[PDB]
Design a binder for this molecule. Sequence first.
Ligand SMILES: [Cl-]
Ligand SMILES: [Zn+2]
Ligand SMILES: [Zn+2]
Ligand SMILES: [Zn+2]
Ligand SMILES: [Zn+2]
Ligand SMILES: [Zn+2]
Ligand SMILES: [Zn+2]
Ligand SMILES: [Zn+2]
Ligand SMILES: [Zn+2]
Ligand SMILES: [Zn+2]
Length: 153
Amino acid sequence: SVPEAVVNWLFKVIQPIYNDGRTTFHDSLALLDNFHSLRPRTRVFTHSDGTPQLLLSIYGTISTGEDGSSPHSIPVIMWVPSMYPVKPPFISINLENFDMNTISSSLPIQEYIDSNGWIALPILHAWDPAAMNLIMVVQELMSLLHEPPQDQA
Ligand SMILES: [Cl-]
Ligand SMILES: [Zn+2]
Ligand SMILES: [Zn+2]
Ligand SMILES: [Zn+2]
Ligand SMILES: [Zn+2]
Ligand SMILES: [Zn+2]
Ligand SMILES: [Zn+2]
Ligand SMILES: [Zn+2]
Ligand SMILES: [Zn+2]
Ligand SMILES: [Zn+2]
């Protein structure tokens, strides 16, 4: 389980920041419970126009579906916007820790990444606030570390 001290800190830090604190709290905790390789922190986000904003961020690694001598995970940083779930999370690669020399360019990461390190996902282009959550975003991210199955005829 998520440690008690972290649960209570999460509730406290969310209240003053989030338009929908109940949803942000629940969904953040569900993400942490389902992905033990992720953990929370608060950080000042710098918006494009310069505006700073204190936000909850969830960071760690997600699975490549490989192990042994193969790369096992990719480091990521998610930011939960203050209007969540009306606005979806921002997702980035942790660039400083990205294993450029081992992770295969065969992973379609380059398809989805911008020059600033942000990841676009199809779920973000079909975002449905009432019916989606943070877990779904991470599950999709995991699926997009792989090229689709092809027509084999
Ligand atoms: Cl790889
Ligand atoms: Zn408690
Ligand atoms: Zn809500
Ligand atoms: Zn729940
Ligand atoms: Zn749980
Ligand atoms: Zn294996
Ligand atoms: Zn690989
Ligand atoms: Zn591709
Ligand atoms: Zn694959
Ligand atoms: Zn065909």
